[PDB]
Amino acid sequence: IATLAPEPLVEHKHRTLILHLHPDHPTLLTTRSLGSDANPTRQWIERPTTVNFTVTGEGLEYTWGNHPPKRVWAQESGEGNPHGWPHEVVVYYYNRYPLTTIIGL
Amino acid sequence: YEHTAVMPNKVGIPYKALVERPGYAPVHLQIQLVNTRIIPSTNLEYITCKYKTKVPSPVVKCCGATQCTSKPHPDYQCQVFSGVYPFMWGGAYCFCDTENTQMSEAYVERSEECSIDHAKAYKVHTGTVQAMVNITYGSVSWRSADVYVNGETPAKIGDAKLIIGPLSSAWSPFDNKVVVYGHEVYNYDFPEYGTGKAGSFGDLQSRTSTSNDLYANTNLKLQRPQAGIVHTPFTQVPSGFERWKKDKGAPLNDVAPFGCSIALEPLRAENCAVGSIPISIDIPDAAFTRISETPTVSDLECKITECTYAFDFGGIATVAYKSSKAGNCPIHSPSGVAVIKENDVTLAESGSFTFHFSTANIHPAFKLQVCTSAVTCKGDCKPPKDHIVDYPAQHTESFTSAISATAWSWIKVLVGGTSAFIVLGLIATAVVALVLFFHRH
Amino acid sequence: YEHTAVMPNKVGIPYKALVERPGYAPVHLQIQLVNTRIIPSTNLEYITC
Numbered sequence: 001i002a003t004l005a006p007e008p009l010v011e012h013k014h015r016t017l018i019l020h021l022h023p024d025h026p027t028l029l030t031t032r033s034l035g036s037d038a039n040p041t042r043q044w045i046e047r048p049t050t051v052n053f054t055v056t057g058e059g060l061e062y063t064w065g066n067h068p069p070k071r072v073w074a075q076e077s078g079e080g081n082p083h084g085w086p087h088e089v090v091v092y093y094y095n096r097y098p099l100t101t102i103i104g105l
Numbered sequence: 106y107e108h109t110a111v112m113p114n115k116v117g118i119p120y121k122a123l124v125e126r127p128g129y130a131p132v133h134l135q136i137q138l139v140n141t142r143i144i145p146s147t148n149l150e151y152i153t154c155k156y157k158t159k160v161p162s163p164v165v166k167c168c169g170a171t172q173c174t175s176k177p178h179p180d181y182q183c184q185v186f187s188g189v190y191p192f193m194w195g196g197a198y199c200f201c202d203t204e205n206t207q208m209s210e211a212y213v214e215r216s217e218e219c220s221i222d223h224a225k226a227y228k229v230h231t232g233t234v235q236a237m238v239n240i241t242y243g244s245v246s247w248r249s250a251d252v253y254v255n256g257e258t259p260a261k262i263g264d265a266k267l268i269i270g271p272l273s274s275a276w277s278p279f280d281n282k283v284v285v286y287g288h289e290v291y292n293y294d295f296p297e298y299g300t301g302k303a304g305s306f307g308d309l310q311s312r313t314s315t316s317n318d319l320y321a322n323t324n325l326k327l328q329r330p331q332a333g334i335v336h337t338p339f340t341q342v343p344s345g346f347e348r349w350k351k352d353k354g355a356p357l358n359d360v361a362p363f364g365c366s367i368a369l370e371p372l373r374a375e376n377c378a379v380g381s382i383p384i385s386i387d388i389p390d391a392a393f394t395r396i397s398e399t400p401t402v403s404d405l406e407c408k409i410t411e412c413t414y415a416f417d418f419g420g421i422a423t424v425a426y427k428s429s430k431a432g433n434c435p436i437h438s439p440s441g442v443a444v445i446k447e448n449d450v451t452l453a454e455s456g457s458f459t460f461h462f463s464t465a466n467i468h469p470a471f472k473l474q475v476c477t478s479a480v481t482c483k484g485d486c487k488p489p490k491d492h493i494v495d496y497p498a499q500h501t502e503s504f505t506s507a508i509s510a511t512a513w514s515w516i517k518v519l520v521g522g523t524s525a526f527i528v529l530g531l532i533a534t535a536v537v538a539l540v541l542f543f544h545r546h
Numbered sequence: 547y548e549h550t551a552v553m554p555n556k557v558g559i560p561y562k563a564l565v566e567r568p569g570y571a572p573v574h575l576q577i578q579l580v581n582t583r584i585i586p587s588t589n590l591e592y593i594t595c
Contacts, residue, residue, distance in 0.1 A: 012492035030355065034364040034378075042355050055493060057502070061364070071364075073497055076414055078488045082467060082509035089512055096507065413568050421569070487568070 005065030014095070015074050017055045019064070022048045027065045034059035034071070106390070112136055112382045114272070117497055121445065123437035123474065124242075124388060130399040131477055132392060133435035133448045136384060137239040139249065142373040145279055146232040151298050151310040153226065154219035155344045156323060158211060160337045165191060166206035167199040173210070179321035180213040182339075192333045207330060209337040213321045215309060223314065224346070225285040226295055227372075234272060238262065243392040254382070264391065270383030278361040278374050288369055289356035308345040400429045400452065402476045409484030412464065415491060416498045418446050420462040422482060426475065428452050434476035436460065441501050442471035450475070463499045466506040549575070557582060 005027045009020035021029065026046045032038045035058035053060060055074040063069045080092025093101045112120045119137040164171060173183035189205045191198045199205060234254035240262050241247045252260040252269045259268045280292040296307030301322045310320045328338040358367040365377040404427040413419030420443065433449050446461040464471065464486060472481045553561040560578035567573075 014492060017493060030359050032359060033362075036362055038360060038362040040355055040360050042359075057498070059364070059497065063359075070495075072493050072495060073416070074493050075416060075489060075491050076465075077490060077492050083511040086515065089509075089515070093507075093512070411568065415568075419569065489568070 002066055005067065007067070008064055014077060014079060015054055015056065017053045017060065017062075017072060019051050019053075019062075020048075021045050021051070021064065023065075029062070029064050031060065031062040034061060106393070107385060107387050108134060109383070109385050112384050114138075114141065114380050114382055115378055116141060116376050118499060120384075121437060121448070123435065123439075126393060128396065129393045130396060131435065131437075132243045132388070133437065134242050134386070134388070135240070135448070136386075137247075138236060139239055140237040140375060141234075141377060142236065142368075142371075142375050143234050143277055143377065144232050144371050144373050145277060146230040147227040147283075147372060148230075149313075150226045150228055150295065151312055152219070152223045152314055153306065153309060153311075153346055154223040155216050155346050156213050156309045156321060157216040158213045158323075158325065158339065158341065160209075160211040160339070163208035163210065163335070163337055164206070165189075165198060165335070168201035168204065169206065171206045171208060173208070176212075178212040179319045180323055180325050182212065182325055182327055183208075183210050184327040186329050189330055190333045191330070191335045193335060197333075198335075207335075209327055209330065211325060211327060211337060211339050213309070213323055213325060215311065215319060219311075220314065222287070224349075227283050227285060229279045229281055229283055231275075231277065236269060238267065238269060240265075240267065240386075242388055245392075265386050265388045267387075268385040270385065272382065273380030276363075276379055278357060278363075278365045278367070278377070279372075283357075285369070285372070289358055290367060290369075290372070291354070291356055292360075303345070304342045304348060305345045306349050308342075399434060400432050400476060402426050402428045402434075402452075402478050405475065405478060405480035407480050407482040409469075409482055412469065412484050412486035413489055414465070414467070414486050415489035416463075416494055416496060416500075418461045418463045418499065419489070420464055420469070420486070421459060422462065422484070423457055423459040424475070424480065424482075425457045426452070427455050428476070430454070436473055436475050438462075438471055438473040440471050441503070442466055442469050442506075443473075444499055445473065452476070464506075465498075465500045465502045467509045553577060555582070 003025060005023055005025070011018045021027070023045050026044050028042065028044055029051070030040070030042045031053055032040045033056070035056065053062070055072055057074055057076070059071055059073045061069050061071045076096070078092060079095045081088045082092050083089075090101070090105075106124065106126055108122065108124045110122060116138045119135050122134045123131045124134050125131050170187070171185060173185075175181070186207045186209065187205070188203045189207045190202060191205070191207070236252055236254055237249060238252050239247050239249040242263070242265070245263065248263060250260065250262050252262070252267065254269055254271060256268075256271055259266050282293065282295050284291045284293045293306070296302070296310070298310050298320065301307035301310065301320065303322045303324050308321065308323050312318060323341045325339055325341040328340055330336060330338065361367065361374070363377045363379050365374045367374050405424065407422060407424045409420070409422040411421050431453050433451060435448050436445060436450060438445055443462040443464045446463075450458055462471070467486050468483070469486065470481070470483055472479070474480075547565060547567050549563070549565045551563055557579050560576050563575045563577075564572050565575055
């Protein structure tokens with residue numbers, strides 16, 4: 001019989017997952033992505049910290065302690081208005097596509 | 106009737122297709138995956154566990170000398186220490202001062218814990234792929250059976266015959282050499298049963314779990330007994346199985362890409378999502394109806410009431426029909442702009458029904474068929490408020506799906522008006538040569 | 547569902563709004579104020595009589 005860590009506080013952002021981890025024992029946190037590049041991270045948490053992970057549309061899977069793994073997918077909420085003046089049309093596609101708007105303009 | 110198409114390699118989402126036969130009404134075909142296991146071929150090489158060095162009782166020659174023979178034993182050691190004069194309880198042990206012999210023999214044997222926690226060293230060879238496929242068509246319910254992923258083994262599922270084609274990619278998460286410890290696997294190299302660095306991984310190799318032969322190098326060295334007491338002291342480096350159990354990386358089930366969950370007992374790699382799967386299903390003619398039996402429809406007009414950019418089914422539209430007679434016909438959309446939640450419809454005489462769809466476009470120009478008749482739908486969609494969801498996407502994101510109608514008119518004049526202005530500039534040269542030629546004659 | 551807006555500082559006049567959750571019917575919302583007290587912090591210096 002092993003200990004169970006307290007569950008983290010989960011708040012969402014645009015393509016960003018924030019976890020508030022408060023452990024009472026040294027606890028392991030491993031994350032991986034469900035795309036072509038897994039990008040695996042691992043660390044031992046001994047103090048109350050906060051971590052930010054970039055969740056894409058392909059997904060992300062994270063385990064915390066002895067809890068079962070959880071999978072999260074990022075939607076396409078965006079931070080702009082696609083119809084209107086071109087001072088806000090451009091800033092809509094910059095957040096969605098920062099790699100094609102700079103090259104394409 | 107053979108239906109041949111390409112199914113993407115995904116587990117959760119279903120594949121919807123409408124099978125067209127001339128002279129017969131179309132049917133709705135659904136193919137859904139449940140499992141996708143990649144099973145390589147493995148042969149066990151050797152096992153590893155912590156050692157246990159047991160020493161026999163040394164001899165105490167009083168006035169003389171002793172020699173030893175090379176006994177067959179893993180990591181066997183012998184030595185002779187001269188002039189020991191040991192002391193036990195009840196006085197000294199022997200007469201002869203400053204000449205005596207002690208044996209102090211030691212050798213290495215596996216532990217009694219080797220049958221519980223040991224690391225299995227496997228060599229991986231490429232093998233077979235299999236899957237479990239749920240199948241329905243027409244009006245019969247869902248029923249499934251295990252299929253094989255090759256190009257040579259048909260499977261009898263339902264009344265039809267299904268041949269699941271080979272995978273588009275030969276990618277496998279396993280390396281050539283893997284180590285299985287407990288319930289997790291690792292990508293690790295081997296000392297190949299001949300070598301051993303005595304402290305890293307191969308200080309004790311046995312061919313099976315109960316093999317008589319055993320390889321063991323551990324730097325075991327005999328030490329002289331001190332001050333006239335009877336004991337055999339030795340000196341050796343610590344175990345490599347304990348050092349590997351601390352200096353260990355992440356397992357392959359936390360490292361493998363494409364969401365490959367790894368099981369153990371056939372050593373599969375379940376539910377990977379890579380490539381595509383060709384299909385070939387031969388639906389029998391008993392599920393085909395005629396054009397005369399199915400109703401015909403006309404006066405189809407479509408209006409989208411609400412659409413959303415989000416995942417799951419965020420779109421809902423109502424259509425209006427004028428049917429000849431009541432009955433059931435399937436609905437299907439050929440283009441990949443919108444997927445459809447349900448298959449059939451309970452039609453009536455001059456009514457209307459609503460259906461739910463799912464796009465990844467701001468303006469969906471998708472098109473769907475109802476009772477082998479055509480209609481198109483257009484509309485607008487709004488971005489959602491959710492940032493992170495716990496379910497995968499039901500649609501397919503394309504390249505032109507993100508272009509709004511405002512920005513499409515902006516890039517229709519930066520490439521249309523400018524490139525036609527050069528045409529206006531080029532014909533000025535074409536007409537100034539005609540005027541200058543007319544100056545001559 | 548979170549719905550943010552700006553209401554005026556009038557007591558008797560209610561604020562009517564219509565929230566819009568996608569995929570769901572709109573729900574009417576009515577907010578009305580009944581009081582508005584500004585309470586400063588005081589320390590007594592002295593009395594006189």
